[PDB]
Amino acid sequence: RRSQLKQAVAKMVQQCCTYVEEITDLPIKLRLIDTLRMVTEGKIYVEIERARLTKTLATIKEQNGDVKEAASILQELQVETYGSMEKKERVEFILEQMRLCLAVKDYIRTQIISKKINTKFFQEENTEKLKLKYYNLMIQLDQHEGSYLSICKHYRAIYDTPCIQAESEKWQQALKSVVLYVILAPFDNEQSDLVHRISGDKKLEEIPKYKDLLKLFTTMELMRWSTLVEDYGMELRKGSLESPATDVFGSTEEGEKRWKDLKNRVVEHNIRIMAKYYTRITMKRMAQLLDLSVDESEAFLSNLVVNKTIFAKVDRLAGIINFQRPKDPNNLLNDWSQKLNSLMSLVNKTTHLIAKEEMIHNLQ
């Protein structure tokens, strides 16, 4: 077994490579089937799966795409996730069938097998294109469900090797899609610091419109939507970074759904801010500030309050919403004691200032 089969089978496989480019499918299928019987033996490990990959390609191309032939490759990946004594080629191996699974439309199996090389990062140290291929797939995967934060993690991971940002012509949308997708996410601490981190960047200045969007979504009171769409709905087709913008506009279902999501985001921002400031508020003032019917306001805040997101207790009979009115008979003098402590400390601190300042004038 000192190459006594490796040399034989390798020679036969290179023969197969020479014939297959000229031979017809009828004989080449028989040749591959015959050569596959020594795959099960192990001991060779490599050189058995390459025949399998070539077979898969052949049986896809003869039909120019098939799903069963995709199923012909699912089994052995984890089998030879450890067969080959090499890092890169197995990574390529076990990510290539991912696109086959996508063509078959099997998200669950795809994401199950995707867990394999998450920790085997830094696979790009000599081939950035492979890392780019890896990241180009999850953007497609999560684009199906509603997760709108992991895709930002991916795009912020396209902040890699400066073979990415030394090509501004696409680098523009590379750093534009991240700031557009961060906004879609619902408010949370992770988003709260993600908007902060993505902001405060020097070269981010190079685009004023998206800088303005981030600035608007970081501050307090927001807009009535109408004015914002009139002031930003047209920049989504001019320039050299509108391809993700096209993705937000082009596809009818995708564009419609994402309009709906931005709408919900802004009205939710209005709700949080006014609850932060106001205490008690009428029906009609709410309906007037949200530019929508009273019934829609109620229906919209209903799933908010049942989600344990906003602490509100609407009383329909007189229509007085009552944010932030829990009340307690033991908290009161907790607050009282706190104020007392602060006052004592402050009176303490004033005297040190008094003394050191009188020192520089009346020593003599």
Binding site: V306, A312, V314, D315, L317
Partner: protein, 159 residues
């Protein structure tokens, strides 16, 4: 199977009946599909009755269930969807969709009423929870039902 059926007949327990049904499925395991399918349907409905719909969704997700394919599992899964969404319209819709089997088993008709009442109470608590004092007409419209029965249910609940 017969022991589980008798056990659930007089409505004393569900954990033990589910246990019996699972081990009976292991009895029909890999040797008789025609009875395995009805075993799975009994398993799923019993697990629903314990107010554990996510348990059903995870359980039918298992590879053994993946092997035992079928179409009744769609009915049970949609019923679980309705239960974890807390909707009476959803459950009524699922009943209309798969009336061919749901109102076909003699045993199901007995427990349908109780599961309906439990779902009704859960849906009502969700609809009326988000706020305080309210006119009864709005909640009556929201639940899509007449008046008198609604406040009678409210009285029985508060009592």
């Amino acid at each position: 199977m017969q022991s589980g059926i008798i056990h659930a007949a007089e409505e004393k327990d569900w954990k033990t009946a589910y246990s019996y049904f699972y081990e009976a499925f292991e009895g029909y395991d890999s040797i008789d599909s025609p009875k395995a399918i009805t075993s799975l349907k009994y398993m799923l409905l019993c697990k629903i009755m314990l107010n554990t719909p996510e348990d059903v969704q995870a359980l039918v997700s298992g590879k053994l269930a993946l092997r035992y394919a079928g179409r009744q599992t769609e009915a049970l899964k949609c019923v679980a969807q309705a239960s974890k969404n807390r909707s009476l319209a959803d459950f009524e819709k699922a009943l209309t969709d798969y009336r061919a089997e749901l109102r076909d088993d003699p045993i199901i008709s007995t427990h349908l009423a109780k599961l309906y009442d439990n779902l009704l109470e859960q849906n009502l608590i969700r609809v009326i929870e988000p706020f305080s004092r309210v006119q009864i007409e709005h909640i009556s419209s929201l639940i899509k039902l007449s008046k008198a029965d609604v406040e009678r249910k409210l009285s029985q609940m508060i009592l």
